Amino acid sequence: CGVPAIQPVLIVNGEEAVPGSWPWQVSLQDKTGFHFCGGSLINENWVVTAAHCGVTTSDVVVAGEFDQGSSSEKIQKLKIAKVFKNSKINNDITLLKLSTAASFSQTVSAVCLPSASDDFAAGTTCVTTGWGLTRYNTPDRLQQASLPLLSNTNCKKYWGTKIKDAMICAGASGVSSCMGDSGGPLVCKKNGAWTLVGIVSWGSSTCSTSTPGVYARVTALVNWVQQTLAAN
Amino acid sequence: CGVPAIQPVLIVNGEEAVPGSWPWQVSLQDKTGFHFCGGSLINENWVVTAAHCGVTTSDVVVAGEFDQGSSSEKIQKLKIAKVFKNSKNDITLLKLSTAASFSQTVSAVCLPSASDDFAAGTTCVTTGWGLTRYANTPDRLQQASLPLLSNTNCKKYWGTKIKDAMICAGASGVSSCMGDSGGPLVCKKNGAWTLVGIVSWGSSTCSTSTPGVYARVTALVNWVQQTLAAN
Ligand SMILES: *C(=O)[C@H](Cc1ccccc1)NC(=O)[C@@H]1Cc2ccc(cc2)OCCCCOc2ccc(cc2)CCC(=O)c2ccc([nH]2)C(=O)N1
Numbered sequence: 443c444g445v446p447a448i449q450p451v452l453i454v455n456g457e458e459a460v461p462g463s464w465p466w467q468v469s470l471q472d473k474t475g476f477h478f479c480g481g482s483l484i485n486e487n488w489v490v491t492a493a494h495c496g497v498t499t500s501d502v503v504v505a506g507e508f509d510q511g512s513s514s515e516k517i518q519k520l521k522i523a524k525v526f527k528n529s530k531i532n533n534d535i536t537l538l539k540l541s542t543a544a545s546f547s548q549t550v551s552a553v554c555l556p557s558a559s560d561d562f563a564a565g566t567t568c569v570t571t572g573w574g575l576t577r578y579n580t581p582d583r584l585q586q587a588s589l590p591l592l593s594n595t596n597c598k599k600y601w602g603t604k605i606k607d608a609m610i611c612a613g614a615s616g617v618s619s620c621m622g623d624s625g626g627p628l629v630c631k632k633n634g635a636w637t638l639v640g641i642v643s644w645g646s647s648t649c650s651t652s653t654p655g656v657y658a659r660v661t662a663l664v665n666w667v668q669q670t671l672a673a674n
Numbered sequence: 675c676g677v678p679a680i681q682p683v684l685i686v687n688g689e690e691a692v693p694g695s696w697p698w699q700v701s702l703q704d705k706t707g708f709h710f711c712g713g714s715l716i717n718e719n720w721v722v723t724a725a726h727c728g729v730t731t732s733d734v735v736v737a738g739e740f741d742q743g744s745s746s747e748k749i750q751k752l753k754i755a756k757v758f759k760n761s762k763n764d765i766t767l768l769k770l771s772t773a774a775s776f777s778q779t780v781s782a783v784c785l786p787s788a789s790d791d792f793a794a795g796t797t798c799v800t801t802g803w804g805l806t807r808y809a810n811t812p813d814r815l816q817q818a819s820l821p822l823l824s825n826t827n828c829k830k831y832w833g834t835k836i837k838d839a840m841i842c843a844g845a846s847g848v849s850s851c852m853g854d855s856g857g858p859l860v861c862k863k864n865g866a867w868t869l870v871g872i873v874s875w876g877s878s879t880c881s882t883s884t885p886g887v888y889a890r891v892t893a894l895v896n897w898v899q900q901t902l903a904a905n
């Protein structure tokens with residue numbers, strides 16, 4: 443996991459991504475085709491996304507897209523067998539089990555899950571991706587941005603008592619996650635491999651580039667994920 | 675009023691409400707039976723709802739519903755006799771052809787006094803069968819807790835659209851949505867649930883970081899009680 447066949451070259455004020463360079467970025471779309479959230483493939487049969495996305499098994503996992511306006515793309519529409527919502531908002535994390543495996547390719551593969559003990563220290567420049575607004579407006583083409591992790595102490599300076607230990611803040615650096623980005627990945631380089639550290643959760647009503655966006659802290663949630671995978 | 679027989683346990687990113695626990699909440703359904711708006715029983719003979727819901731006598735008030743995908747519920751489909759519109763405020767009153775039978779699941783919400791103070795920061799509730807996602811509509815009644823905003827904070831989002839006769843709530847991770855219109859924004863004064871807002875408008879995408887806008891029942895209730903006694 444964690445090593446795209448197509449290497450990334452490095453959301454408000456982000457940059458257009460190399461097509462297929464984020465092969466774990468899926469798009470979550472209702473039956474009509476409307477993208478309402480992002481998600482991340484963790485393996486052939488599983489997608490991780492935000493709980494608040496309210497995903498049901500009538501919705502569709504789309505993997506392989508770069509341009510949501512194009513139709514000349516070799517994408518996969520994957521049905522959702524089961525939905526697993528964290529029952530501890532709170533912990534904006536939800537697992538999706540796919541009805542049929544995703545076929546992995548150049549443009550479709552998995553992100554690495556961290557070990558719960560992993561240390562992605564404040565100040566590490568990580569990357570977030572998605573089709574969220576670029577301007578507070580939804581882009582057709584997958585966007586990406588580099589941005590630093592905040593310590594939870596430094597985050598509470600903007601958000602106060604809201605930032606729980608199972609959350610992590612990134613940004614406040616001239617870029618920001620925005621509407622449409624939710625459920626998508628914030629990833630950091632760990633031992634040469636892209637590892638899921640955040641799930642796009644919430645942030646500024648206006649996606650202000652000087653306010654930290656808030657993400658479900660994946661390390662804090664990964665045992666829950668593993669438990670879910672083992673019993674399913 | 676404002677004291678549901680079945681006690682509440684505490685719309686996008688809300689939660690499923692306990693069956694029958696918002697007994698004043700009615701569905702407004704057209705002649706095909708399609709749910710188009712919410713409303714609130716204020717007595718056995720009257721429902722308050724939104725003007726923009728365009729209710730007519732061909733529409734129907736449904737009381738005692740929780741799950742519209744269920745048929746085993748003892749519901750009352752109540753004919754509307756007359757629709758009274760507030761002239762020049764997004765409120766309309768419905769007078770029913772036959773009185774609504776009150777029970778554990780059907781009863782009335784309380785009405786404020788015009789001078790009542792419901793300060794910003796109060797935790798209130800809105801309820802409804804409106805979209806849970808911007809079909810994304812629930813069979814089962816939804817509820818959500820949310821803070822009243824001051825009008826001056828609200829104008830940070832909506833500017834001059836915010837009139838004194840409006841009250842804002844939310845921008846707090848939940849949102850009223852399409853299909854919620856006309857239904858209640860209630861607050862628990864002296865232990866009793868009291869209609870403080872009528873779901874009216876707000877974010878076109880039901881943004882949970884945007885305050886919803888509700889008709890401020892305090893500025894309207896004199897007209898409500900006046901219409902009632904006169905009619
Ligand atoms: C999803 O696409 C979008 C991503 C995003 C990221 C950064 C900036 C802007 C947008 N996210 C949202 O629209 C989220 C959805 C959401 C997330 C978590 C959640 C509910 C809804 O539960 C956790 C709630 C804890 C946070 O609670 C609050 C409540 C109020 C405020 C902040 C946090 C102040 C209002 C505010 O800025 C706000 C409210 C909701 C969101 N921001 C939000 O981003 N919703």
Ligand SMILES: *C(=O)[C@H](Cc1ccccc1)NC(=O)[C@@H]1Cc2ccc(cc2)OCCCCOc2ccc(cc2)CCC(=O)c2ccc([nH]2)C(=O)N1
Binds near residue numbers: 764850878886887
């Ligand atoms: C009803 O079911 C639905 C519930 C709801 C609540 C909160 C958010 C989203 C949905 N309400 C609506 O769809 C309302 C109906 C409505 C109510 C009053 C009214 C018009 C329409 O007239 C007086 C209110 C002033 C209208 O002001 C605006 C506000 C915003 C905009 C234009 C005009 C920008 C577009 C927008 O967000 C918008 C337009 C209509 C509604 N939102 C809306 O919520 N309709």
